[PDB]
Design an enzyme around this catalytic site. Structure first.
Site, PDB file in Angstrom:
ATOM      1  N   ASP A 101       0.778  -1.226   0.000  1.00  0.00           N
ATOM      2  CA  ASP A 101       0.000   0.000   0.000  1.00  0.00           C
ATOM      3  C   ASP A 101       0.822   1.294   0.000  1.00  0.00           C
ATOM      4  OD1 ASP A 101      -3.310  -0.002   0.930  1.00  0.00           O
ATOM      5  OD2 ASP A 101      -2.191   1.873   0.658  1.00  0.00           O
ATOM      6  N   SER A 105      -6.589   4.084  -1.932  1.00  0.00           N
ATOM      7  CA  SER A 105      -6.959   2.736  -1.509  1.00  0.00           C
ATOM      8  C   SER A 105      -8.294   2.246  -2.064  1.00  0.00           C
ATOM      9  CB  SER A 105      -6.980   2.654   0.018  1.00  0.00           C
ATOM     10  OG  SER A 105      -5.667   2.672   0.557  1.00  0.00           O
ATOM     11  N   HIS A 108     -11.811  11.764  -1.097  1.00  0.00           N
ATOM     12  CA  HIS A 108     -13.005  11.530  -0.304  1.00  0.00           C
ATOM     13  C   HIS A 108     -14.110  12.471  -0.716  1.00  0.00           C
ATOM     14  CE1 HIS A 108     -11.859   8.515   2.705  1.00  0.00           C
ATOM     15  NE2 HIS A 108     -10.632   8.955   2.479  1.00  0.00           N
ATOM     16  N   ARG A 149      -4.520  15.718   4.460  1.00  0.00           N
ATOM     17  CA  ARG A 149      -4.043  14.362   4.183  1.00  0.00           C
ATOM     18  C   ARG A 149      -4.009  14.085   2.680  1.00  0.00           C
ATOM     19  NH1 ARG A 149      -3.388   9.891   7.742  1.00  0.00           N
ATOM     20  NH2 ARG A 149      -3.659   7.873   6.681  1.00  0.00           N
ATOM     21  N   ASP A 150      -4.925  14.719   1.954  1.00  0.00           N
ATOM     22  CA  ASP A 150      -5.001  14.561   0.508  1.00  0.00           C
ATOM     23  C   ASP A 150      -4.470  15.827  -0.143  1.00  0.00           C
ATOM     24  OD1 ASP A 150      -6.293  12.005   0.408  1.00  0.00           O
ATOM     25  OD2 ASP A 150      -8.133  13.005   1.073  1.00  0.00           O
ATOM     26  N   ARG A 206     -10.356  16.016   9.898  1.00  0.00           N
ATOM     27  CA  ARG A 206     -10.885  14.752   9.409  1.00  0.00           C
ATOM     28  C   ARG A 206     -10.488  13.609  10.362  1.00  0.00           C
ATOM     29  NH1 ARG A 206      -8.386  13.297   3.919  1.00  0.00           N
ATOM     30  NH2 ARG A 206      -9.006  11.249   4.745  1.00  0.00           N
ATOM     31  N   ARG A 252     -16.618   8.766  -0.790  1.00  0.00           N
ATOM     32  CA  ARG A 252     -15.853   7.572  -0.431  1.00  0.00           C
ATOM     33  C   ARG A 252     -16.489   7.091   0.865  1.00  0.00           C
ATOM     34  NH1 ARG A 252      -9.425   6.053  -0.329  1.00  0.00           N
ATOM     35  NH2 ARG A 252      -9.541   5.004   1.710  1.00  0.00           N
ATOM     36  N   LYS A 296      -6.135  -1.017   6.587  1.00  0.00           N
ATOM     37  CA  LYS A 296      -6.429  -1.491   5.235  1.00  0.00           C
ATOM     38  C   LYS A 296      -7.342  -2.717   5.179  1.00  0.00           C
ATOM     39  CE  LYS A 296      -4.214   1.843   3.695  1.00  0.00           C
ATOM     40  NZ  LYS A 296      -4.782   2.921   2.874  1.00  0.00           N
ATOM     41  N   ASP A 336       2.038   3.307   3.060  1.00  0.00           N
ATOM     42  CA  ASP A 336       1.022   4.331   2.965  1.00  0.00           C
ATOM     43  C   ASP A 336       0.680   4.998   4.283  1.00  0.00           C
ATOM     44  OD1 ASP A 336      -1.333   5.597   1.419  1.00  0.00           O
ATOM     45  OD2 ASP A 336      -2.256   4.715   3.235  1.00  0.00           O
ATOM     46  N   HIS A 351       1.858   8.996   5.125  1.00  0.00           N
ATOM     47  CA  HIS A 351       0.900  10.096   5.223  1.00  0.00           C
ATOM     48  C   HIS A 351       1.329  11.132   6.265  1.00  0.00           C
ATOM     49  CE1 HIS A 351      -2.418   9.638   2.496  1.00  0.00           C
ATOM     50  NE2 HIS A 351      -2.664   8.390   2.852  1.00  0.00           N
ATOM     51  N   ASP A 403      -1.269  -0.379  -4.821  1.00  0.00           N
ATOM     52  CA  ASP A 403      -2.487   0.219  -5.354  1.00  0.00           C
ATOM     53  C   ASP A 403      -2.309   1.672  -5.792  1.00  0.00           C
ATOM     54  OD1 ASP A 403      -2.087   0.903  -2.667  1.00  0.00           O
ATOM     55  OD2 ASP A 403      -4.198   0.743  -2.117  1.00  0.00           O
ATOM     56  N   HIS A 404      -1.187   2.276  -5.403  1.00  0.00           N
ATOM     57  CA  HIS A 404      -0.855   3.662  -5.755  1.00  0.00           C
ATOM     58  C   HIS A 404       0.382   4.125  -4.972  1.00  0.00           C
ATOM     59  CE1 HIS A 404      -2.195   5.068  -1.859  1.00  0.00           C
ATOM     60  NE2 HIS A 404      -3.160   4.173  -1.992  1.00  0.00           N
ATOM     61  N   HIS A 444      -0.879  11.125  -1.513  1.00  0.00           N
ATOM     62  CA  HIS A 444      -0.450  10.164  -2.515  1.00  0.00           C
ATOM     63  C   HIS A 444       0.312  10.849  -3.636  1.00  0.00           C
ATOM     64  CE1 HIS A 444      -4.237   7.683  -1.319  1.00  0.00           C
ATOM     65  NE2 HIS A 444      -3.310   7.691  -0.380  1.00  0.00           N
TER      66      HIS A 444
HETATM   67  O1  LIG Z   1      -6.384   7.767   4.558  1.00  0.00           O
HETATM   68  C1  LIG Z   1      -7.312   7.887   3.658  1.00  0.00           C
HETATM   69  O2  LIG Z   1      -8.589   7.836   3.818  1.00  0.00           O
HETATM   70  C2  LIG Z   1      -6.723   8.100   2.251  1.00  0.00           C
HETATM   71  C3  LIG Z   1      -6.340   9.569   2.122  1.00  0.00           C
HETATM   72  O3  LIG Z   1      -7.370  10.523   2.288  1.00  0.00           O
HETATM   73  O4  LIG Z   1      -5.638   7.165   2.005  1.00  0.00           O
HETATM   74  P1  LIG Z   1      -5.909   5.752   1.307  1.00  0.00           P
HETATM   75  O5  LIG Z   1      -6.608   6.025   0.010  1.00  0.00           O
HETATM   76  O6  LIG Z   1      -4.651   5.038   1.101  1.00  0.00           O
HETATM   77  O7  LIG Z   1      -6.793   4.986   2.241  1.00  0.00           O
HETATM   78 MN   LIG Z   2      -3.775   2.369  -0.680  1.00  0.00          MN
HETATM   79 MN   LIG Z   3      -3.104   6.685   1.583  1.00  0.00          MN
END
Ligand SMILES: O=C(O)[C@@H](CO)OP(=O)(O)O
Ligand SMILES: [Mn+2]
Ligand SMILES: [Mn+2]
Length: 508
Positions: free
Chosen positions: A10, A60, A121, A151-152, A183, A259, A334, A401, A405, A442-443, A460
């Protein structure tokens, strides 16, 4: 029993630039030897290649959805964007039914969700659309409960989203920022109900740090080292000191997050007739017309703006159809991705599908414990392997991942190195049982945790993900995409590919 294992690293992607690149700087003897000794390639994990707008980084949900479907899975961000582009967004019966509810019953319309343009999200533009729609529909009282990102997007970028939103509010002539919360509290996915409650009580009881000025709130939080993601659920108040607005009986709520993993918890808190996670208090709001932008869970007693569409014959289902025993395994962070998203948005396990959940460490942030629970997941899985019970395995190591972050180089390097020590034990145990492993991601994320100027990079990346099939004597195509992973596994498994899986085996 020769098992075929899909191992997802991840947030582990390939990037030439080594600056702030934890993947490239980490000592990965295991990953390196497999890349050197077995057939490999890279896959497109972002943009149109995975069902997202061009330029949009992956994640993810998107990654696991595409990885398991074996086809380019059309995503929510894209679909809703088009709805707004084609003038379909304003025609949404659910958005309108919700707006009709507040007008007809003279209540208030509440809008909450991630305040940024991360696109993972949500998207702040979708909020602007709702605001303009609210204005167009003549909805008097509209209150915004923003969940700060970080985070994003940049870790301290909230001010610009707040600033832009205020400008939009003034221009559309409707809307009022009522609360601002990180968040970390309002969008939890680890059943840390203490976090959730903090967000809930601010929104329904106006309890939390109070400010007249939304931007003074952020300034103050920054002043205390608390940035966007971790901002304490705060309340904006009027000139008379009263909160700008609290969620009450018969109010309408439109959660503009598309999401599901980080939206189900707070959604259940608001809609569940009998909630037990914690005491919502006797005067908690009821009869709320709750709207979900997209499908979150069957539990949420509300409505869905953009209805979901079945994803038939995903790897999990094909594996199940042919009487194979499959195991889904990962630690908390995850677990939703290796199950629900991997199963094409399905909650229920497929007949023959086993899942192991290993609890993630009890630390606020994972830079505090970079190896997370990787070793327990590994130990747990190694036992299953010795047992000779599964034909297929889907493992996800969250570390690259999760700790990437944090936007910190050293802890993410450790994260990657811990995962590597683990990766070798698992692939070595699978090969010993005659099985074959599909090592991928996955990324991206860990490949860039520092900006060119050395500042923390907490989101990411758009780089390609690695792909290694531990089977000598074969060749892998080069311009693949995640949706090709499922077909490759089925190929390796010698199972027939369903017409639904429009992806193509990477094996030449
Ligand atoms: O932590 C999450 O919700 C996202 C980032 O906003 O990360 P990931 O897509 O890897 O879950
Ligand atoms: Mn991921
Ligand atoms: Mn992530």
């Amino acid at each position: 029993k020769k098992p075929v294992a899909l191992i997802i690293l991840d947030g582990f992607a390939l990037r030439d630039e080594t600056y702030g690149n934890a993947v490239a700087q980490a000592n990965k003897p295991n990953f390196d030897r497999y890349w050197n000794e077995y057939p490999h390639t890279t896959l497109k994990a972002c943009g149109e290649a995975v069902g997202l707008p061009e330029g949009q980084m992956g994640n993810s949900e998107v990654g696991h959805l595409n990885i398991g479907a074996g086809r380019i899975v059309y995503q929510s961000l894209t679909r809703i964007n088009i709805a707004i582009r084609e003038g379909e967004f304003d025609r949404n019966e659910t958005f309108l039914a919700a707006m009709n509810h507040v007008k007809q019953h003279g209540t208030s319309l509440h809008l909450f969700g991630l305040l940024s343009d991360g696109g993972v999200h949500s998207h702040i533009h979708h909020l602007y659309a709702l605001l303009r729609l609210a204005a167009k529909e003549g909805v008097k009282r509209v209150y915004i409960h923003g969940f700060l990102d970080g985070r994003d997007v940049g870790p301290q970028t909230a001010p610009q989203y707040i600033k832009e939103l205020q400008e939009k509010i003034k221009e559309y002539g409707v809307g009022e920022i009522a609360t601002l919360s990180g968040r970390y509290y309002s969008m939890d996915r680890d059943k840390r109900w203490d976090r959730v409650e903090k967000a809930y009580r601010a929104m329904v009881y106006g309890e939390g740090p109070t400010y007249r000025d939304p931007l003074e709130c952020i300034e103050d939080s920054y002043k205390h080292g608390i940035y966007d993601e971790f901002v304490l659920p705060s309340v904006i108040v009027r000139e008379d000191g009263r909160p700008v607005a609290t969620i009450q009986d018969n109010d309408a709520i439109i959660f503009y997050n598309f999401r599901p993993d980080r939206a189900i918890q707070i959604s259940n808190t608001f809609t569940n007739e009998d909630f037990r996670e914690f005491d919502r208090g006797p005067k908690h709001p009821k009869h709320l017309f709750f709207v979900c932008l997209t499908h979150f869970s069957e539990t949420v007693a509300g409505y869905v703006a953009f209805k979901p569409t079945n994803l038939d014959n995903t790897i999990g289902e094909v594996l199940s159809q042919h009487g194979l025993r499959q195991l889904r395994i990962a630690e908390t962070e995850k677990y939703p991705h290796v199950t629900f998203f991997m199963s094409g948005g399905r909650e229920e396990e497929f007949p023959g599908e086993d899942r192991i959940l290993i609890n993630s460490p009890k630390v606020p942030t994972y830079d505090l414990k970079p190896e997370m629970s990787a070793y327990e997941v590994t130990d747990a899985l190694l036992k299953e392997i010795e047992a000779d019970k599964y034909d297929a395995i889907i493992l996800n190591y969250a570390n690259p991942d999760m700790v990437g972050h944090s936007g910190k180089l050293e802890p993410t390097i450790k994260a990657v190195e811990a995962v590597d020590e683990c990766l070798g034990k698992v692939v070595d145990a699978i090969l010993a049982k005659g099985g074959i492993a599909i090592i991928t991601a996955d990324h991206g994320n860990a490949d860039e945790v520092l900006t060119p100027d050395g500042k923390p990079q907490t989101a990411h990346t758009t780089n390609p993900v690695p792909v290694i099939v531990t089977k000598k004597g074969i060749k892998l195509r080069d311009g693949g995409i995640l949706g090709d992973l499922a077909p490759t596994m089925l190929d390796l498994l010698g199972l027939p590919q369903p017409k639904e899986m429009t992806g193509k085996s990477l094996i030449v």
